Symmetry: C3
Subunit: 125 residues, 3 copies
């Protein structure tokens, strides 16, 4: 399903902040006693609207809210951290949750090299 | 392992309540400020004892308690939400955690279409 | 990457304590009301330095600390329980996250039995 930014305006540049699970710690800065405070753990980046991604991302986050709010209403967890790991499991289940019938449309097995390697095995005669 | 209901009685109908992660929100009812209270998020259903499922389910929940209690004794989490996602990971690991030897009993790959498609490739001569 | 114990000393024996998710409960000891207190849920074992595992394990835990501390700095969870389940998902994603090209180095499918079973199918003539 396509994404159409229907917002009054779009800031086409995303000046973002985030963290990294393993920065390049210099010396003892990785030790919590010596490391940065809560305010100094962030990295920054700047992404422009190539492929209309930024304006599409703003619209996607807007459209996601209804389903996300309905999900949070139905969970008893106070803080939800598992949405992404859940997507990864459903990703694997939708491809490998059942028997993989080679050449079927829902089986992500490419047997081309196997077939030729077996095909050219008869090329002795 | 089969399930034998050994309870003094069995209520053969399951009038159940649950939630749905995405109901058919009408208008602004998905917005938490406008939506239902904690008491009005539930849906209901009624399931009868077809295939003896309800009486078997009551016995299964009874038999599950020992293993479930022993699991909860050994975990340090105050609230456990991960039992089902854990089953899904172990489900995938038991089938795809190692090399899939085609035609072996523990490899869920059906190569039938591949074999015939290669077999009838020799039917030119 | 190899592990070289660079510690001042190594205790080459690991007298360890842990729990088991399902011990052999005798009678009603699995019932929390009747079972052991928090102090009596532990089992013990003793492992010696076969294959240099114990001294290697002490060095590994030492070397793990920097990456583990940097990970904990970047997470907003107060208590992290998901590192191992995360490794299991990444384990499956690195092998089955994309199309499995048979005979490729990143596809863990062994088609040997399939090939011979197809090869000796031509042995009628
Ligand atoms: C995702 O993105 C969409 C689109 O941007 C967001 O939609 C907005 O939804 C809210 C409802 O939650 C709307 O609020 C209502 O606004 C009306 C009128 O607002 C007027 O002023 C706006 C500010 O300038 C303007 O943008 C509006 O323009 C459009 O819409 C009108 C139709 O109303 C249309 O004729 C125009 O041509 C524009 O297309 C509009 O001029 C206001 O009257 C509402 O108030 C009543 O209802 C609420 C209950 O919802 C009640 O509390 C009030 O007391 C009052 O009774 C209400 O405030 C908002 O206007 C929408 N914005 C747009 C641009 O459509 C959506 O919210 C985003 N989702 C998330 C999760 O962020
Ligand atoms: C899963 O399902 C099973 C089966 O329904 C549940 O098993 C029950 O286990 C508990 C133990 O935790 C039992 O409690 C004990 O009951 C005895 C005697 O109970 C009598 O009265 C019952 C109520 O009517 C009746 O059902 C019983 O009937 C059967 O059993 C007797 C053998 O005792 C047999 O002869 C009959 O023919 C029936 O087959 C029985 O008539 C009671 O004396 C016990 O008390 C002592 O011990 C406890 C410690 O456990 C102590 O605290 C007391 O002070 C006292 O010293 C105890 O109360 C219960 O009887 C079992 N029910 C059945 C039907 O077998 C099991 O609990 C379920 N699991 C979960 C997690 O829910
Ligand atoms: C993983 O394993 C490694 C190796 O065991 C651990 O490394 C240790 O790192 C800490 C830093 O966090 C070091 O602390 C510093 O120690 C110096 C000097 O210590 C002296 O005394 C030690 C105790 O007997 C001895 O082991 C040391 O020996 C070696 O190192 C010297 C070089 O210094 C070398 O010449 C020798 O031949 C040995 O190889 C040494 O004799 C001390 O001066 C430091 O103090 C200053 O700096 C700190 C800031 O870090 C500051 O707070 C102080 O006030 C002071 O200004 C500091 O205490 C420790 O010595 C290292 N140990 C070894 C054996 O190398 C590492 O910690 C482990 N990781 C985890 C997570 O556990």
């Amino acid at each position: 399903e396509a994404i159409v930014n229907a917002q009054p305006k779009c800031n086409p540049n995303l000046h973002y902040w985030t963290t990294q699970d393993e920065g390049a710690a210099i010396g003892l800065a990785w030790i919590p006693y010596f490391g940065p405070a809560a305010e100094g753990i962030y990295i920054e980046g700047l992404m422009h609207n190539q492929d209309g991604l930024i304006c599409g991302l703003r619209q996607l986050a807007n459209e996601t809210t209804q389903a996300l709010q309905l999900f949070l209403r139905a969970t008893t967890e106070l803080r939800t951290f598992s949405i992404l790991n859940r997507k990864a499991i459903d990703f694997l289940l939708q491809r490998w949750g059942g028997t993989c019938h080679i050449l079927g449309p829902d089986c992500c097995i490419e047997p081309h090299d196997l077939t030729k390697n077996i095909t050219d095995k008869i090329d002795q005669i």
